[PDB]
C-alpha cells in the first residue's frame, strides 16, 4: 500500500512546469502586459510573484509532499472542517474540463486543416467567407472601410466555430461534428496518458512539456527574422509608468500570476504527494516558478515579434492589430501572420502542435489532481481499479464539454472561462492558506517543512504564508466581486441573465465549503464551542 512515487525527479519537475505553462501564457500574458504598461507591467508582475505567487506554490507543494493525501482527504490532517475544498475543486475541475478541452479541440481542428499546400485561411474564395472579406495584407487599394473582415477571422468564426449559425447563448444551436471528433481524439489521448497513474503521465510529459519549448524557440527565431518585429518588441517593452499608478494594473498582475502558477487547484498537492518525503521541494518550487515566469515572458516575445510584423505590413500602429482579446489572438491574428509567412504550411503545423501539447499537459495535470484527490479520499472503492474512474472522469468531462462544442459554443467557452475559475478558485486558495497558516499552526507547518527538507523556512516565507499571501489573495477576490464583467466575444454583448448564470457557476463551486462546514458542525456532538474545537483539530489517527 505504498504511493507510486515519481520514476525520477525530472518527471515531477516536467509535470509541474507543463501544468503551470498553459494556453493562458500564450494569449493572456502579452495581452495584459501591453494593456497595463509593457516593461512597467514587469515591475508589478514580479512583485506579485515574489510576495504572493511563490509562497502559495511552495506552501502547497510542501503540504502535499508531507501529508501526501491529495486534496479531499489531506484536510483530515490539517483542518477537518475544511474538507469541502476538495469537492469545490472537483466542481471547478469539471467546468475547466468543459471549456479547456474544447479550446484544445479548436487547436486540433486548425492543425488538421493546416495539412494542405495552401492554408484555408488565406483567401476569401472559400464558401464560408462573406461579402465583407478583404485580404488582410493586400495593398491599400482595398481599404478596410469601417466593418471589413479578414479571411482568417471568417475561417475561425464561420468554418471552425460556425458562430454565425448561432445568435448568442439564447440559441446555443446545433453541434459541430468535426469538433466533436477532434475533442474525442483529445479525450482518448488524455485518458491513455493518465489512466495508469503517474508512472505513465510522467513519461508522456517528457515530450508534452518540452516540445512546446522547441517550437517556441523556432517561432521566436522566425518572428525575430520577420521585417518589422522591432516595432512589436518595442511596443511590448516600452514602459508606460503612468499606467502603473492605477490599481487596475496591479490587480491584473496579481491575478495573472496567481492563475499562471495555478495554486489552490489541488493539482500541486497531487503532484507533490508522490515525490519522496525527503525530496527538496523548496528548490523545485523556486525553479519551476522561475521557469513558468520566463516562459510567459518568452511567449509574449514570440507573439509580439509577429504582431509588430503584421502592423508594419499594413502600415498601422501595433495597437490597432492586437485588439483581439482571447483565443482570437491565436486563431485569427497569428493565423493571419502564419498564412503570409514565406515557408507557411510548416509554421502552422508546429504552432498548432505547440498549442495542443501545451494544453494537453495542463489537462493531464488537472485531471490527475482530481483523480488523486478522489482516489485518496475513497481507497476502499477505488485505487484497485485505477484504469476505471478515469474512463468515467473523461466521459463526464466530454459530456460536459458537449455544450461547449455547439455552434454557439465559443460563447460558453468565454462564459466558463470568466466565471468558472474566478472568485471561486481564489476563495478556495484563500481558505487553504488560512487553514494551513492560522487554523493549522504556522510554527507547526514550518516544523513539518524542517523535518521534511532539513531546514525551517526563513522568516520571509513565514510572513508571506501568514499575512501577505492571504492578504493579496483577498485583494484579488475583492477586486473581482466589485466589477461585473461585460463579456463580448464576437459582436455579441452578453445579456444580464448570462452574468447571473456566471455568478451561479461561481456560487456552485463555493457552495461546497460552507455546506460541509455546517454538516460537520451538525454531525459532531457537544456544545457549540466544543463542537467547533473538535471539528477544527486534525483527527490524528
Amino acid at each position, epitope marked *: 500500500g505504498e504511493r507510486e512515487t515519481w520514476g525520477k525527479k525530472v518527471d515531477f519537475l516536467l509535470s509541474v512546469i507543463g501544468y503551470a505553462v498553459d494556453l493562458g501564457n500564450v494569449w493572456r500574458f502579452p495581452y495584459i502586459c501591453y494593456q497595463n504598461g509593457g516593461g512597467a507591467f514587469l515591475l508589478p508582475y514580479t512583485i506579485m510573484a515574489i510576495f504572493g505567487g511563490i509562497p502559495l506554490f511552495y506552501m502547497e507543494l510542501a503540504l502535499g509532499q508531507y501529508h501526501r493525501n491529495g486534496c479531499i482527504s489531506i484536510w483530515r490532517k490539517i483542518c477537518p472542517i475544511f474538507k469541502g475544498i476538495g469537492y469545490a475543486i472537483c466542481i471547478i475541475a469539471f467546468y475547466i474540463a468543459s471549456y479547456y478541452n474544447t479550446i484544445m479541440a479548436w487547436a486540433l481542428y486548425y492543425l488538421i486543416s493546416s495539412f494542405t499546400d495552401q492554408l484555408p485561411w488565406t*483567401s*476569401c*474564395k*472559400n*464558401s*464560408w*467567407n*462573406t*461579402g465583407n*472579406c*478583404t*485580404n488582410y495584407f493586400s495593398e491599400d487599394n*482595398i481599404t478596410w472601410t469601417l466593418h471589413s473582415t479578414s479571411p482568417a477571422e471568417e475561417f475561425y468564426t*464561420r*468554418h471552425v466555430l*460556425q458562430i*454565425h*449559425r448561432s445568435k448568442g447563448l439564447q440559441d446555443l444551436g446545433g453541434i459541430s461534428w468535426q469538433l466533436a471528433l477532434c475533442i474525442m481524439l483529445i479525450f482518448t489521448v488524455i485518458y491513455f496518458s493518465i489512466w495508469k497513474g503517474v508512472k505513465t503521465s510522467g513519461k508522456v510529459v517528457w515530450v508534452t512539456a518540452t516540445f512546446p519549448y522547441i517550437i517556441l524557440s523556432v517561432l521566436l527565431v522566425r518572428g525575430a527574422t520577420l521585417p518589422g518585429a522591432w516595432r512589436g518588441v518595442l511596443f511590448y517593452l516600452k514602459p508606460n509608468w503612468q499606467k502603473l499608478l492605477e490599481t487596475g494594473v496591479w490587480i491584473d498582475a496579481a491575478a495573472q500570476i496567481f492563475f499562471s502558477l495555478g495554486p489552490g487547484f489541488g493539482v500541486l498537492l497531487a503532484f507533490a504527494s508522490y515525490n519522496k518525503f525527503n525530496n527538496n521541494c523548496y528548490q523545485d518550487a523556486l525553479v519551476t516558478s522561475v521557469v513558468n515566469c520566463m516562459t510567459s515572458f518568452v511567449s509574449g516575445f514570440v507573439i509580439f515579434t509577429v504582431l509588430g510584423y503584421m502592423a508594419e505590413m499594413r502600415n498601422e500602429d501595433v495597437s490597432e492589430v492586437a485588439k483581439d482579446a482571447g483565443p482570437s489572438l491565436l486563431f485569427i491574428t497569428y493565423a493571419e501572420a502564419i498564412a503570409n509567412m514565406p515557408a507557411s504550411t510548416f509554421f502552422a503545423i508546429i504552432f498548432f502542435l505547440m498549442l495542443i501539447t501545451l494544453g494537453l499537459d495542463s489537462t493531464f495535470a488537472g485531471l490527475e489532481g482530481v483523480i488523486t484527490a478522489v482516489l485518496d479520499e475513497f481507497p476502499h472503492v477505488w485505487a484497485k481499479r485505477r484504469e476505471r474512474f478515469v474512463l468515467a472522469v473523461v466521459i463526464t468531462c466530454f459530456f460536459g464539454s458537449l455544450v461547449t462544442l455547439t455552434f454557439g459554443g465559443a460563447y460558453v467557452v468565454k462564459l466558463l472561462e470568466e466565471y468558472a475559475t474566478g472568485p471561486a478558485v481564489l476563495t478556495v486558495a484563500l481558505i487553504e492558506a488560512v487553514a494551513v497558516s492560522w487554523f493549522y499552526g504556522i510554527t507547526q507547518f514550518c516544523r513539518d517543512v524542517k523535518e521534511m527538507l532539513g531546514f525551517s523556512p526563513g522568516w520571509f516565507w513565514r510572513i508571506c504564508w501568514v499575512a501577505i499571501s492571504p492578504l493579496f489573495l483577498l485583494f484579488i477576490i475583492c477586486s473581482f466581486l466589485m466589477s461585473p464583467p461585460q463579456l463580448r466575444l464576437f459582436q455579441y454583448n452578453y445579456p444580464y441573465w448570462s452574468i447571473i448564470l456566471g455568478y451561479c457557476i461561481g456560487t456552485s463551486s463555493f457552495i461546497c465549503i460552507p455546506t460541509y462546514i455546517a454538516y460537520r458542525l451538525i454531525i459532531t456532538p457537544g456544545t457549540f464551542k466544543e463542537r467547533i474545537i473538535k471539528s477544527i483539530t486534525p483527527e490524528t489517527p
Partner: antibody
Amino acid sequence: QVQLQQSGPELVKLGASVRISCKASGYRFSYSWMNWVKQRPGKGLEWIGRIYPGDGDTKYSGKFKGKATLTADKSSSTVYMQLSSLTSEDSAVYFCARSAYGSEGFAMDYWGQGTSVT
Amino acid sequence: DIVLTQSPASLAVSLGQRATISCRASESVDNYGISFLNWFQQKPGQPPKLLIYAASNQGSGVPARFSGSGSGTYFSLNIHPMEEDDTAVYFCQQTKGVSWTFGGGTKVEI
C-alpha cells in the same frame, strides 16, 4: 452598377481556337468568382469553369478540364477563356457570369450578353 | 459533382395558378447553414436572370411572386400565381462542390 461586357461573335473552324474575354466593372472583381456557362442552341445551361482573380484559382467540370482554360487580368479587369479543338459540338453561346460571395450561395447575380461562336 | 434533377420538365400552368418546380440533389447542398442552391430564369434569347439565391433568399430586382423553399436535398420554386410575362425556362444550380452544375431545366407555359 455592375455590368459585364464580353467580345462579339466569332467563327468556328474545326481544330481552331478562340479567345473570349469578359471585362468587368462596378465591383471589386478580384474578390468574386467569374463563371463561364455554355448554352447549346435548343438545349439547357452547362457550367464550364471558374476563376478567382486575385488568387488565380480555377475550377472546371469533368468535360472542359483540357478543352477550356480560364485566365484573369487585374489591370484590365478582364477574364478570358481559351477554347481549343473547336468541334461543331461546341458552337454555342458562352455567358460570363459573376458569382456572389460565399454567404450569398455563390449566386451568379450578373451575366454578360453572351458571346455566340458559330 | 452533385447531379440535380428537376422532376417537372414541363409546366402547363394557366393564369392565376401557382407553378411548383422541384429539384433533387444527389447529395445535400447545405454547408454552414447556407443551402448552396440558386434558381435562375431565362427568357428566349436572353441571359439567365437570377431569381433566388441560397434556395430561399429573394434575388435582386425580382418580384415577390417568385419564392423559393426547401432545404437539404429537396428544393422547390413555388411561383405565386403565374402570368404571361414569366413563361421562361427555370434552372436549378448547386454551388456546393468543386464543379458547380446546372439542372435539367424546366420550361413553363400556359
